[PDB]
Scaffold this active site. Structure first.
Site, PDB file in Angstrom:
ATOM      1  CB  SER A 110      -1.048   0.115   1.083  1.00  0.00           C
ATOM      2  OG  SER A 110      -0.591   0.167   2.394  1.00  0.00           O
ATOM      3  CG  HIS A 163      -2.295   4.636   3.058  1.00  0.00           C
ATOM      4  ND1 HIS A 163      -3.639   4.450   3.330  1.00  0.00           N
ATOM      5  CD2 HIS A 163      -1.783   3.395   2.843  1.00  0.00           C
ATOM      6  CE1 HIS A 163      -3.927   3.160   3.264  1.00  0.00           C
ATOM      7  NE2 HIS A 163      -2.821   2.498   2.957  1.00  0.00           N
TER       8      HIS A 163
END
Length: 181
Positions: A110, A163
């Site tokens: 991610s 992120h």
């Protein structure tokens, strides 16, 4: 598409996830996670191998999709080396930031993926030449995917530092890469 870095990373994640299945999450996490203890700080692989760990079939498939779609693009247009270096810098930097936000127990691609999204999108704008770009429908979903993380949506336990740090690394490298290109 079918680059060797793209596929090697997809295979590594699959091998790890299968290993996580047989042994359980915790056992693999103990050896692959970012060092929880400074004594472990020279176990160098842990700064990167946290990226190979996934905690559910959806987690892995969704990540590998994005990885395949974006990793493939970078690999095909800019080559293997570029994908490797984006991967290594982002895995390193997103884990580092994520460790600071919430400690060492996290995993997933991610963070490298957000870097790729940041990279592909900024390279597309500044440098349409490169033959890569991110669609409007995807950078919106990317922004939704981030904010949905902050706001703890539907029980999910998202690595939020990963992120943003990944997103930022990718924007940055793409910026650097566009000044020269």
């Amino acid at each position: 598409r079918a680059g060797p870095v793209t596929w090697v990373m997809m295979i590594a994640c699959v091998v790890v996830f299968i290993a996580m299945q047989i042994l359980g999450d915790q056992e693999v996490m103990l050896w692959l996670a970012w060092p929880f203890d400074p004594t472990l700080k020279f176990e160098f692989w842990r700064y990167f191998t946290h990226a190979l760990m996934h905690f559910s079939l959806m987690h892995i498939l969704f990540n590998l999709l994005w990885w395949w779609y974006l990793g493939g693009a970078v690999e095909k247009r800019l080559g293997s080396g570029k994908l490797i270096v984006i991967t290594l810098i982002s895995a390193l930097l997103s884990g580092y930031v994520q460790q600071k936000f919430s400690g060492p127990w996290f995993g997933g691609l991610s963070g490298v993926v957000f870097a790729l999204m940041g990279y592909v999108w900024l390279r597309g704008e500044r440098d349409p030449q490169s033959g890569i770009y991110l669609q409007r429908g995807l950078i919106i979903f990317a922004l939704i995917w981030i904010v949905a993380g902050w706001f703890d949506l539907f029980g999910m336990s998202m690595a939020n530092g990963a992120h943003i740090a990944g997103l930022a690394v990718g924007l940055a490298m793409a910026f650097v890469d566009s000044l020269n290109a």
